[PDB]
Design a protein around this nucleic acid. Structure first.
Ligand SMILES: [Mg+2]
Length: 758
RNA sequence: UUACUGCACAGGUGACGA
DNA sequence: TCGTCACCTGGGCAGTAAC
């Protein structure tokens, strides 16, 4: 039982001698660091300034002398290590500090990719993809009670377009509408300048500008987004352009695949271990062994959660390892009770797509047959319904109509429904050129708005999807079916849980940030989703209808206390029963908000029961990766030479970093998509220190299970539904709040049990 | 906006302190 | 106002759908 990390032990001195002076105002710290530059390392923490001498000779420093022992206060040397790593690698310029980040000295993957695909173009030399490395000094706990410092190595790719904007023009590339950034960024300057309206003299005309509406061709460059890469390259190359991307993708796989990443990490550790790292001129650190996660000795640092089971009945008896397998065999969890066995579904679509939409609806409702075993039965037999009646609502509108498409859809819905009686759901087909129009003329959001006001949830669909090859279409229709059923109040599946306490509530919060352009300040909206322990099963509760950023903490507390009150009433908790409340988000709550939440839930449940409360953050973008050297991977596809997910930990692997923190693996070899897919990064699950329920392993496993509860897809989500559904709610409600004639009135009436946000 | 996955880039932001 | 440690969210593009 071993998982290898991307980090190395750092052998530090036991002790370091330091000078301390009280400095209750931290505004002084910056000038003082400058004054003692070169001779002293300086660090402010907890009202006080800490000085570690790094070189002999003045200036002098007044203060109390103290021995800072590493085992007890590892933050001091962790911080010194950020800078010492920089100093240790003088030939690699920092592109960022804390963590030290830098570029490979030679390697340039576009040149290599071109050669390997046998492509060429004069300008290609001005498109650079360079490996980017970061070394992050992190505190971890090899076992409870003991801290150490590790150096964690992470790799990504710098994409840059150095080309002059002038050159890109004459090559036939249309630069209109592309974002542009400053070549040299003033200290504490923005990068984004805006979009390209046109070029004049030595002068770019910018719309959506962030500052001035003009800048010289010479002080600006295209932003190195994938969008600009593809737009420039396909113009200069197509259709050889895909050939270069695959080859670039192959090159990058050379640094990001499991074995190849493990090798790059090894080589980086060798390089840093070659010389001592000077913490001062007389005090050294040494980079040591690869940090592992194991159960050797007094370490209990790795476990494997059981496989999540998808459950399709209350008796626990009907279950599967995979959502579709189970759904296909058993039908949905709620089919014995599902109330509406003959849904009427409005189908809103551009009249000119009529035949394509019929083909799609036929495939959806009645299946694709045995040649497409992924979607044979169709929606009706899949979900155990009697029939589906489509009410056709053609719309006279063209993809060219960018300004009045939304008006036409809504006019057509209103006229059709006036004379049609009640519809239970709707499907809205959209042109690709309309899907991303601004919200004031976007038919997605206008039709979603109108139909949700009327209490009619929709599943929308873009024509490129409607037209998918049958091999892709069968999977499309799995996902479409599951969300549509849930939109009709259905519960497709649950995930196993064996209840140990009398009740458990999990609430999540999710954030969305909206603006009409990148110039405009993003406005924040929030959402809240609740999940309850059932008997053998987790059950999705209700969902917020207000979106609310200011006061989100009051909303969390209002939602938990109202829910605890109703759960108690439903279940009639007995004296001495234990109730557990778990909160999830992608960021940690404030201590003061945890205190207020704990106080109000405790007072609401009363002294008759025992309450356990945990506050959990789920992080995706941290410096930790898990390597399972025992995993050979799987056949990229049956039956190739290439392998996918080589060295990928199993789904459900949980490693201990520290008392409050676990790493959770979610993307197993099975789930990994391709040979060139990188070694996955696990989720970091952190418990808030003020939590009263402390078992982070159990909370990591619960988070795992909730990834499987997503009804947007047959495949699991990247984050538990408690957070993920909250983000979809927040985005939709925040958008809707700007749409004329939107009302939320039906969200808690007709739509109370509809999962309208999927 | 069927989704999952990945990546790039940009924007910054959060928590903890005194 | 700060210092310090940390990483989240939006927009877009490309490959594939846990046996
Ligand atoms: Mg959806």
């Amino acid at each position: 039982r071993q998982l290898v990390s991307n980090g190395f032990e750092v052998n530090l001195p036991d002790q370091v001698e330091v000078i301390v002076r009280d400095l209750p105002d931290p505004s002084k710290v910056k000038e003082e660091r400058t004054r003692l530059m070169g001779y002293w390392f300086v660090h402010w923490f907890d009202g006080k300034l800490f000085h570690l001498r790094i070189k002999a000779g003045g200036p002098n420093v007044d203060g109390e002398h103290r021995a800072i022992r590493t085992a007890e206060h590892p933050w001091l040397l962790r911080a010194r290590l950020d800078d010492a790593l920089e100093e240790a690698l003088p030939k690699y310029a920092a592109v960022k500090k804390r963590p030290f980040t830098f570029l490979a000295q030679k390697d340039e993957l576009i040149d290599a990719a071109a050669t390997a695909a046998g492509l060429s173009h004069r300008l290609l030399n001005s498109f650079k993809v360079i490996p980017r490395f970061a070394l992050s000094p992190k505190i971890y706990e090899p076992v409870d009670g003991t801290t150490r410092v590790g150096v964690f190595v992470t790799i990504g790719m710098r994409y840059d377009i150095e080309a002059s904007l002038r050159d890109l023009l004459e090559a036939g590339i249309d630069l209109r509408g592309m974002y542009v950034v400053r070549r040299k960024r003033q200290p504490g300057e923005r990068g984004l300048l805006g979009r390209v309206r046109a070029i004049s003299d030595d002068m770019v005309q910018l719309f959506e500008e962030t500052d001035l509406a003009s800048v010289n061709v010479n002080d600006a460059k295209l932003e190195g987004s994938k969008e600009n890469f593809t737009r420039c390259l396909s113009a200069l190359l197509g259709h050889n352009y895909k050939k270069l991307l695959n080859a670039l993708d192959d090159q990058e796989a050379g640094y990001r695949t499991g074995p190849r990443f493990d090798d790059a990490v090894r080589r980086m550790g060798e390089f840093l271990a070659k010389k001592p790292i000077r913490l001062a001129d007389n005090i050294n650190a040494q980079v040591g062994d690869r940090i592992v996660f194991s159960n050797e000795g007094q370490a209990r640092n790795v476990r494997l959660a059981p496989k999540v089971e998808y459950v399709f009945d209350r008796t626990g008896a009907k279950s599967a390892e995979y959502a579709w397998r189970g759904l296909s065999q058993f039908g949905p969890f709620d089919r014995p009770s599902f109330a509406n066995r003959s849904p009427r579904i409005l189908v809103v679509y551009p009249s000119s797509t009529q035949g394509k939409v019929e083909n799609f609806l036929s495939a959806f409702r009645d299946g694709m047959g045995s040649n497409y075993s992924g979607f044979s039965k169709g929606f009706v037999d899949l979900m155990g319904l009697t029939k589906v009646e489509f009410v056709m609502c053609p719309v006279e509108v063209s993809s060219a109509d960018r300004n009045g498409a939304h008006t036409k859809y809504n006019s057509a819905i209103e006229d059709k429904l006036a004379g049609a009686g009640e519809v239970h759901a709707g499907i809205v087909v959209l042109f690709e050129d309309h899907a991303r129009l601004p919200d004031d003329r976007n038919p997605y959001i206008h039709t979603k708005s109108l139909l949700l006001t009327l209490g009619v949830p929709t599943q929308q669909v873009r024509m490129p999807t409607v037209l998918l090859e049958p091999k892709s279409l069968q999977y499309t229709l799995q996902n479409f079916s599951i969300a549509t059923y849930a939109k009709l109040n259905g519960t497709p599946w649950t995930v196993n849980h064996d209840k140990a306490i009398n009740d458990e509530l999990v609430v999540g919060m999710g954030l969305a940030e909206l603006s009409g352009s990148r110039t405009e300040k993003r406005q924040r909206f929030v959402g809240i989703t609740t999940v309850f322990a059932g008997d053998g099963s987790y059950l999705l509760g209700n969902v917020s209808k207000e979106c609310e950023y200011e006061g989100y903490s009051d909303a969390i507390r209002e939602s938990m206390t109202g829910i605890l009150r109703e759960l108690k009433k439903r279940n009639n908790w007995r004296p001495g029963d234990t109730v557990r409340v778990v909160f999830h988000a992608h960021r940690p709550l404030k201590r003061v908000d945890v205190a207020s939440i704990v106080f109000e839930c405790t007072r609401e449940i009363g002294s008759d029961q025992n309450i356990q409360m945990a506050f959990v953050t789920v992080s995706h973008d941290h410096p930790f990766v898990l390597i399972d050297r025992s995993e050979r991977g799987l056949e990229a596809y049956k039956g190739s030479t290439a392998r996918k997910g080589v060295f990928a930990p199993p789904r459900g692997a949980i490693s201990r970093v520290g008392r409050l923190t676990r790493l959770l693996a979610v993307n197993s070899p099975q789930l990994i998509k391709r040979a060139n897919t990188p070694l996955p990064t696990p989720l970091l699950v952190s418990l808030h220190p003020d939590s009263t329920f402390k078992d982070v392993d159990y909370l990591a496993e619960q988070a795992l299970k909730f990834t499987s509860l997503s009804w947007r897809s047959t495949l699991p989500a990247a984050t538990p539904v408690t957070i993920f559904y909250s983000e979809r709610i927040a985005e939709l409600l925040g958008r809707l709040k700007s749409i004329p004639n939107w009302s939320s009135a039906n969200l808690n009436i007709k739509l109370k049990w509809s999962r309208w946000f999927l």
